RNA sequence: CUAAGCCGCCCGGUGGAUGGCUCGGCUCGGGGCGCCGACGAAGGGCGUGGCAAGCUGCGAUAAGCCCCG
RNA sequence: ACCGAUAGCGAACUAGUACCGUGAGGGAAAGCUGAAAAGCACCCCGGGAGGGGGGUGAAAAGAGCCUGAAACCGGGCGGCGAUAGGAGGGUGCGGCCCGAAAGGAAUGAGCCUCCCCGAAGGAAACCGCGGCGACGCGGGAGUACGAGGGGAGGGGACCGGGGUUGCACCGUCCGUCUUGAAACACGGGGCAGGGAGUUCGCGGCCGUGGCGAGGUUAAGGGGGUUAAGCCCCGUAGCCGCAGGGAAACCGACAUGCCCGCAGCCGGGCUUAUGCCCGGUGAGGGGCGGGGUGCGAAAGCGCCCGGAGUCACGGCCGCGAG
RNA sequence: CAAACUCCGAACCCACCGCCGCCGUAGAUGGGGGGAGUAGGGUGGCGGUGUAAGCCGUCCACCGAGAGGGGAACAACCCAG
RNA sequence: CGGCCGCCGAGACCCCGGCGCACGGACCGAUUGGUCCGUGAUCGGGUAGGCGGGCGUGCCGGUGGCGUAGAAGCCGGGCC
């Protein structure tokens, strides 16, 4: 149902706009963490983040997951499919799938893929 | 650790088919055999022609959720269905005049599974 | 919602192979009988001479993949298709 | 047919690998004596375990005769003979040699035990027979030739 | 149009990580070959190149001399 | 199915070389231009080193030479910037600035107006009455409003996101022993790279697969192969089929009976599911009987109505660093 | 007058039986197997001891191993998991 | 001090939408499973520790591919 589809897309948009960037404790303090930003669970005995005190960054929780019906979909609402040639370009569903040309595809093959996608009426996320 | 269950695709398909058959015909014997087959491999049912002769009557239908082995002696005329048969067990049943079939053939012959006796 | 992704014909073996996808968001995996009925109704196929080789569901996606075959006559099935598949279909 | 990864791969970030406080898992002191030490003779660290799960670990029992003089007496049962008569017939251990059916259990096994039941009248020939075996054979109607 | 100072982006310096490469290592079932010396051995010293210090090779015939293929 | 220049032998290279100690002896660092040197002819400045033009090359990759990260330093750019206090961050938004691509968007952005339904919750104007009083009670009214879910109209280029900074509130760093860490308790100048449940033997278990009263090979042999891959043989050996006992030695239910879960059969209620009742009941439990050891015997311990064995993977115990 | 007295004697605690309540055929009570960690505890009420702090037990409530809202900050106090 | 009347004030209590988990069910996978459905006032803090799933790196047997119209690597951004 497109109505529920749109409602859940808006719900996911709001939720992932409010979602924060989960980063390990003291990521800002040392360059070794700034150049390689990640999240690591705080395990220390006195870690304030582990103790989950107010005024400290938050930690990932299962509740933050987006609704099932629209999980992993493009913000436009389509479904991404990685494509490396025309053979697997042709195997998509234009009404429900979109093609993302792999970064390693040269321009010679990319122009062919783009013209074939135009012929088949399939949306392309990176048309160049 | 975790119970993975049978690695045999044929056995998994047979279990699923038994559950569906029990649903279709409104009987519980097939679901019972399904979970009995699902039990862990190190505890899988083991039966012998001696026990079958001891407890089965002539012309009866027997289902063994596991393996049937040829230890002992057999006189009865029994239709026995089991996942696996040892050559000795199958030969003994054939000589006694019984039938060594699979649960699939048992289902086909008796879809409602009335009168079938489970041996473990 | 069944969408056919490929149809192939092989008269040398005498059958038609059908690759399709069922789009069923918010619904369980459709039953084999329902899928067969829908496919036969849409393709005008003979219900008595068609088999659903498999239906597969992959993780959270609501796009299940189905493969089916349709034979010209029962002779080719009795010659090729295995007994367990025939029993599962229930057409024998 | 099932394969799994090692627990260390899951414990990579554990910082202890399931050994508790960092003081434990050091050596002989952590085990309370290397090997089978502490089982009761002088050190009683594992005396409580020894007196329950490994009784008679300390002490002595009777003697053992030299293996050279220890003769082996193979034993077979009437149940086994009756159940495997056909195989004996194939191997030649059993034949007819007249109306009666003879079986030579002298080639294998030296003593016949009386476990089970006897159905058909045979004649076994062995060296020694249990009283129960002889009684069962006579009741079944076979002959027990003492050869 | 604020002096020093702080964070971020770009460019430049300093450094030598990463990536790719490999005439070197390590391991190995099977196969081959296994002693040299008073007819002066192995290890070493010193010499030897047109320009030649190191390594390598050679010994006042000294990065070489002669014969068969 | 080993490593790929802090790895692999200590040595990928003028390596047991240079160097340290009287001595015995100890012992490093150090690889890469380009396809071809085509390795910058000439001009100006400079004492020189070198700098600026100009040439070579697909690309300076310019020999201080494949790529050129981080730490650190200098310049430009954007933000703050000399009356302001907290481990340098968290929530929310406001200034200044950026904003092609990958995110939405002219098939309509922020925005302005209007209409409908709305969970939990939920006023007041005014009317009458109670209370010394703060105030309360009935109607208004479960009304206006309400998270959110929809629709229509106007405009026509932003929104999301990002850097810095301001305001309000909150927040005394990281690892570790400890009852107790911000600690005047220990380890913590920065960055890059390396870094710590491995292998064998035995044993107890579980996940799965083969065979099954049997299971399984070991050393080794033949065939074939570029090859150690692949095929077949190999029953010696090991475990199980019979246990009890120090030993001599003796030597057992293939079901005699009772309870009974699942399943099966019959009946009643139940739309159906399901529930109840009565039989049969594999597996399960219990009697009875049996073997052996102690005994004069009774009686007790262990055992007896057939499931084990091999293999792959995992957890654990002991010994080896 | 009595911790090492009792002619008397509660609150209260324990065992068992019937029932209400709760849990249990979506499998409890119970049984078998694999893997542990734990052998310094603290605050609070009570009991013995000590001038007191404190020491030694007991009660299992809270911190240890526990967020959020308060007691100005506060381990232990109040609400709250 | 003996009382009383209003109002503020939590992640607690109620409601709306979402995620996962435990249990049961239907259907569906050629190796541990997948989609959906029903109940949860009687599921959702966590140290030692136990258990399940998932993410990342080198190499090997397969399978399907990209690249001088520019691979690996490296700096800054968008999305999931």
PDB file of C-alpha atoms (C1' of nucleotides) in Angstrom, chain F residues 172 177-180 203-206 261-262 275 314-317, chain G residues 25 27 33-36 40-42 63-65 73-76:
ATOM      1  C1'   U F 172      34.623  16.520  37.971  1.00  0.00           C
ATOM      2  C1'   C F 177      43.674  -3.147  41.676  1.00  0.00           C
ATOM      3  C1'   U F 178      39.877  -1.949  45.183  1.00  0.00           C
ATOM      4  C1'   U F 179      33.894  -2.152  49.487  1.00  0.00           C
ATOM      5  C1'   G F 180      35.014   2.419  47.512  1.00  0.00           C
ATOM      6  C1'   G F 203      40.378 -38.333  28.369  1.00  0.00           C
ATOM      7  C1'   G F 204      34.907 -36.385  29.274  1.00  0.00           C
ATOM      8  C1'   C F 205      31.030 -34.199  26.505  1.00  0.00           C
ATOM      9  C1'   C F 206      27.988 -32.111  22.869  1.00  0.00           C
ATOM     10  C1'   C F 261       3.469 -40.160  28.380  1.00  0.00           C
ATOM     11  C1'   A F 262       3.232 -39.487  22.981  1.00  0.00           C
ATOM     12  C1'   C F 275     -11.725 -30.814  26.352  1.00  0.00           C
ATOM     13  C1'   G F 314      33.494 -27.198  18.795  1.00  0.00           C
ATOM     14  C1'   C F 315      33.904 -26.621  24.631  1.00  0.00           C
ATOM     15  C1'   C F 316      36.688 -28.388  28.615  1.00  0.00           C
ATOM     16  C1'   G F 317      40.667 -31.298  32.083  1.00  0.00           C
TER      17        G F 317
ATOM     18  C1'   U G  25       0.908 -29.861  29.062  1.00  0.00           C
ATOM     19  C1'   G G  27       5.932 -28.707  29.853  1.00  0.00           C
ATOM     20  C1'   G G  33      25.061 -33.663  30.794  1.00  0.00           C
ATOM     21  C1'   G G  34      28.642 -29.147  29.073  1.00  0.00           C
ATOM     22  C1'   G G  35      30.842 -24.374  30.621  1.00  0.00           C
ATOM     23  C1'   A G  36      31.864 -21.263  34.359  1.00  0.00           C
ATOM     24  C1'   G G  40      38.955  -9.332  50.629  1.00  0.00           C
ATOM     25  C1'   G G  41      32.856  -7.406  50.252  1.00  0.00           C
ATOM     26  C1'   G G  42      30.411  -2.146  51.763  1.00  0.00           C
ATOM     27  C1'   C G  63      25.954   0.061  46.100  1.00  0.00           C
ATOM     28  C1'   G G  64      29.223  -3.750  44.287  1.00  0.00           C
ATOM     29  C1'   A G  65      27.035  -5.124  39.042  1.00  0.00           C
ATOM     30  C1'   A G  73      27.448  18.520  46.282  1.00  0.00           C
ATOM     31  C1'   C G  74      27.127  12.754  48.721  1.00  0.00           C
ATOM     32  C1'   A G  75      27.589   4.777  46.976  1.00  0.00           C
ATOM     33  C1'   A G  76      24.457   3.479  50.943  1.00  0.00           C
TER      34        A G  76
END
